[PDB]
Amino acid sequence: MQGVNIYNISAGTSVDLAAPVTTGDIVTFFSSALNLNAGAGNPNNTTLNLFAENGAYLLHIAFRLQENVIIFNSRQPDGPWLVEQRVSDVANQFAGIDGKAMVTVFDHGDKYQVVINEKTVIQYTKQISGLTSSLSYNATEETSIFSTVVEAVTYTGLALEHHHHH
Amino acid sequence: MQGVNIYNISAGTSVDLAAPVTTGDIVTFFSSALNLNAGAGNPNNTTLNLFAENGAYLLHIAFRLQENVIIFNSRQPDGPWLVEQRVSDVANQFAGIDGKAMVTVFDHGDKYQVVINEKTVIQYTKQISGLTSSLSYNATEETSIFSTVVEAVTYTGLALEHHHHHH
Numbered sequence A: 001m002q003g004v005n006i007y008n009i010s011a012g013t014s015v016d017l018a019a020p021v022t023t024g025d026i027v028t029f030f031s032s033a034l035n036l037n038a039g040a041g042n043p044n045n046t047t048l049n050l051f052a053e054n055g056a057y058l059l060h061i062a063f064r065l066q067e068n069v070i071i072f073n074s075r076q077p078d079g080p081w082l083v084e085q086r087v088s089d090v091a092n093q094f095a096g097i098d099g100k101a102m103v104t105v106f107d108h109g110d111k112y113q114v115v116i117n118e119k120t121v122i123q124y125t126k127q128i129s130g131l132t133s134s135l136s137y138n139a140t141e142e143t144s145i146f147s148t149v150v151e152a153v154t155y156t157g158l159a160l161e162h163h164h165h166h
Numbered sequence B: 001m002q003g004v005n006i007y008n009i010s011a012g013t014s015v016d017l018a019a020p021v022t023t024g025d026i027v028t029f030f031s032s033a034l035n036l037n038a039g040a041g042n043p044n045n046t047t048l049n050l051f052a053e054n055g056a057y058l059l060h061i062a063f064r065l066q067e068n069v070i071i072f073n074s075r076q077p078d079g080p081w082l083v084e085q086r087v088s089d090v091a092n093q094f095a096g097i098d099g100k101a102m103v104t105v106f107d108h109g110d111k112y113q114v115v116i117n118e119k120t121v122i123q124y125t126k127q128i129s130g131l132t133s134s135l136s137y138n139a140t141e142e143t144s145i146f147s148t149v150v151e152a153v154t155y156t157g158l159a160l161e162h163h164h165h166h167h
Ligand SMILES: CC(=O)N[C@H]1[C@@H](O[C@H](C)[C@H](N)C(=O)O)O[C@H](CO)[C@H](O)[C@@H]1O[C@@H]1O[C@H](CO)[C@H](O)[C@H](O)[C@H]1O
Pocket: A043, A044, A060, A062, A071, A073, A081, A084
């Protein structure tokens, strides 16, 4: 069954999903603010995470104003960060909309399509696979590029099994 | 391919979609306000609409506070309104979330699933089929249950099917 779930996530906290996100599903983070002059991160200004049941970081999205780049990576909870993917020019990805922003993640099975507002920033080839069962938004009150509380909206149960009888 | 399009629809206006909404696609209307004391509609307080290229109301969602009901219907541009599907108790459908609201419509090909926030309020069997080429949000600042501007976000190019054959 297709469904919509809404989660208010405060900076520095995580949430367990009522319905997991799998291939064909969508997850969008909504920020009621956009602070592109928040100062240097430590090293990250803001991070958004998709966790698998086992605790693995399936997708780690990190924004760094001082390096002017958006990082995408994965890792096991007790392991080292894997191969970092980078996309430069943070402001250009949010260009067109001020005072708010949205980050959408499409789970395509083999890759994660990340879209900031209307722009696809990267087709991220997965380094770790599995179902997303938890989300987190990490940042300090002072240096986050997003609002203190971000709202995560998930669209699940989207893929359909179509049986054909001959 | 999959894409996100954002539209900011002021009350009483409509917008053409850059990417049409078809089977497997999703549209969510976001309101920064929830005015359950907006007063009397005439008879509608607010309407959210998915239009076909010929102007047909593929899906008409009308919120009525005084009649305490959310109506779902369809009709051709030059045709009469068809069979209404009703959901009583407007407030109850939005319960749990205050100061704002979210209305999502899934185009499942044969039906339209309408969800208010996290609550699926109806699996509306289509009365008219076709792709959605435009959307509208109609109301007056005076009696709308939503904010003056409603943000509509469409997720398109979504369709994902796994085919299974038997003989
Ligand atoms: C402090 C710092 O700049 N750490 C980043 C840096 O780490 C190198 C390898 C070294 N350990 C150090 O300088 O401390 O460079 C790596 C990439 O080579 C990485 O960006 C380090 O930041 C970490 O990045 C991961 C995601 O890849 C997470 O964002 C961590 O929170 C972050 O510390």
